[PDB]
């Protein structure tokens, strides 16, 4: 995601910690975030090129199918394998279990809470033949733009404009709302976990997703904009809110 979903996801996962979990975080972050993990959700694509053995781990390349598995396609485009979004997940949530080596688990904090963020990216779980539609150009309205970019950030920016009214907490708190009134039950089955973390579980959900709505009726040279906009929004939502629960949830068992 751009800047506006990862925030969106660590609003939610912040207020959802407990309180083992909520002193943990207080305790990891810089003075200069202000208490606020939202505030360096995006330090990890700020560090891509000066820890380049980290770019390969935002995503999965998959074959052009809509499944996902992480020994077949975790790796990453030298086949090491683990190299991928799922394999980051396990590497820095096993690195937090350590918290109160060797590791930084200040990095291992904003890197955990940037992948499960990109692992709900659909297009972060999607074709290596497109570069996860990168390579997919289309327009937004009237304007260029690729189908990984629509998806990283164009959906959510043209709600916040047109559905909230430039409101920065106006899509958050409509989520969280329906997290507790519509989505209960789903919550429940987002947050359990049989493992500490499932990035397997989320990555799967990812490429169907990818399939199903955003791969689905898209041509290079299209015009996407209202039909595609409003029936894609909703799971775009949904992706932001199974996000922050989730960090939420797999914090709590680590911190726990
Ligand atoms: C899980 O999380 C961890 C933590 O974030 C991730 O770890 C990171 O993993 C990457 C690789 O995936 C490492 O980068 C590579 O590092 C090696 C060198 O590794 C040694 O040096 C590291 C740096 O040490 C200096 O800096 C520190 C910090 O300032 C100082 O303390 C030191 O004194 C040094 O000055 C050091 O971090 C490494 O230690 C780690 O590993 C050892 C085990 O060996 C542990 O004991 C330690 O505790 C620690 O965990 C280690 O000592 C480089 O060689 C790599 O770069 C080369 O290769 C690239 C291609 O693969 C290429 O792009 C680069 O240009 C570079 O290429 C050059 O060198 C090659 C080899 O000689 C040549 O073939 C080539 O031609 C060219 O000349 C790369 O930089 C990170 O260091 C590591 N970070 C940490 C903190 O561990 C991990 O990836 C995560 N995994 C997943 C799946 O998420
Ligand atoms: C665990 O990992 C985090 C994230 O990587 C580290 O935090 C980062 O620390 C560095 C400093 O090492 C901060 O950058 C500095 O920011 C200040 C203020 O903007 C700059 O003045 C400073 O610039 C100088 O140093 C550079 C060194 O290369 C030069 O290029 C410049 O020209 C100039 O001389 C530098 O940019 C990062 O902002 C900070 N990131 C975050 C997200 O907080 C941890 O480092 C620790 O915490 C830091 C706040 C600081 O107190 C460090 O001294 C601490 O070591 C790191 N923890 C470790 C290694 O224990
Ligand atoms: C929070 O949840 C509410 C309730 O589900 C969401 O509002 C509902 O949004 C759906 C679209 O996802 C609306 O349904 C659509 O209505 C039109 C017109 O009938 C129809 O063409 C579509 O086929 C679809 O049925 C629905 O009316 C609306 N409900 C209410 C009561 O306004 C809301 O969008 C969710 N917000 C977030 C951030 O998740
Ligand atoms: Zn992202
Ligand atoms: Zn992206
Ligand atoms: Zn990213």
Request: aromatic share 14%; net charge negative.
């Given at each position: 995601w751009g800047k506006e979903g990862h925030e969106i996801i660590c609003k939610i996962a912040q207020t959802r910690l407990d309180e083992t979990a909520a002193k943990a975080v207080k305790e990891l972050?810089?003075?200069?975030?202000?208490?606020?993990?939202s505030s360096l959700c995006l330090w990890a694509d700020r560090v891509k090129?000066?820890?380049?053995?980290?770019?390969?781990?935002?995503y999965i390349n998959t074959p052009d199918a809509c499944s996902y598995q992480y020994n077949r396609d975790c790796k990453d485009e030298s086949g090491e394998?683990?190299?991928?979004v799922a394999g980051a997940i396990y590497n820095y949530t096993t690195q937090l279990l350590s918290y109160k080596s060797q590791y930084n688990l200040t990095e291992a904090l904003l890197f955990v809470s940037h992948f499960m963020g990109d692992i709900h990216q659909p297009l972060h779980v999607s074709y290596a033949s497109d570069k996860g539609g990168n390579t997919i150009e289309v327009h937004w309205y009237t304007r260029k733009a690729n189908l990984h970019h629509i998806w990283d950030s164009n959906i959510i920016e043209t709600a916040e404009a047109?559905?909230?009214?430039?409101?920065?907490?106006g899509m958050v708190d409509a989520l969280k709302k329906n997290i507790t009134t519509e989505w209960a039950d789903q919550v429940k089955r987002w947050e359990?976990?049989?493992?500490?973390?499932?990035?397997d579980i989320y990555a799967s959900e990812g490429i169907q997703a990818a399939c199903?709505?955003?791969?689905?009726?898209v041509t290079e040279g299209d015009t996407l904009e209202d039909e595609y906009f409003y029936s894609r929004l909703p799971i775009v939502y949904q992706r932001l809110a199974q996000g922050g629960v989730r960090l939420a949830a797999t914090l709590n068992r680590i911190f726990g």
């Open positions: 972050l810089p003075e200069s975030a202000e208490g606020d993990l090129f000066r820890y380049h053995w980290s770019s390969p781990l935002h394998k683990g190299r991928c047109d559905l909230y009214n430039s409101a920065l907490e359990t976990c049989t493992k500490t973390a499932c990035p199903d709505w955003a791969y689905k009726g």
